[PDB]
Amino acid sequence: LNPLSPDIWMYVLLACLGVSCVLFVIARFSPYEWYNPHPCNPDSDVVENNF
Amino acid sequence: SAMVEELRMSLKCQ
Ligand SMILES: CCCCCCCC/C=C\CCCCCCCC(=O)O[C@@H](COC(=O)CCCCCCCCCCCCCCC)COP(=O)([O-])OCC[N+](C)(C)C
């Protein structure tokens, strides 16, 4: 753990939980991530996210 | 029409 300062090991882990929460919110806010996981048969209101 | 589907994606359950 020596090649990075203990300021940096906390700032990576705080950004690891930070970007994870932003990418979850920004995928639900976006309409393009909503689609069907069943492309074989046609639509039966099966629009579903993955995140 | 944006206020229709903004609650569809703030569905809060799934
Ligand atoms: C290249 C990869 C980069 C990306 C990865 C970065 C991830 C963040 C990683 C680390 C972030 C925080 C680490 C800083 C702690 C150092 C303080 C310390 O030395 O005390 C203690 C060690 O400290 C420990 O707790 C060792 C375990 C830390 C790494 C493993 C964390 C989880 C595994 C990963 C799970 C997934 C991680 C994500 C999910 C959360 C004891 O040390 P000491 O007894 O005092 O003797 C040493 C003395 N000296 C050091 C002063 C010489």
Nearest to A31 among B9, B10, B14 (CB): B9
* Cβ neighbours for B1, distance < 8 A, ≥ 6 positions apart: none
Closest chain B CA to residue A26: B9
In the DSSP assignment, the letter for residue A29 is S
Report the C-alpha gap between B9 and A31 in whole angstroms: 8
Pick the closest to residue A51 from A29, B7, A39 (CA basis).
A29
Task: Count Cβ atoms below 10 Å from residue A21 Cβ, excluding itself.
Answer: 9
Beta bridge partners of A48: A35
- Residue A26 in tokens: 């920004």
Report the C-alpha gap between A6 and A39 in whole angstroms: 48
Report the C-alpha gap between A38 and A17 in whole angstroms: 31
Q: Residue A28: list chain B partners with CB under 8 A.
A: 9-10
Task: Count Cβ atoms below 10 Å from residue A11 Cβ, excluding itself.
Answer: 13
Q: Hey, is A35 helix, strand or coil?
A: strand
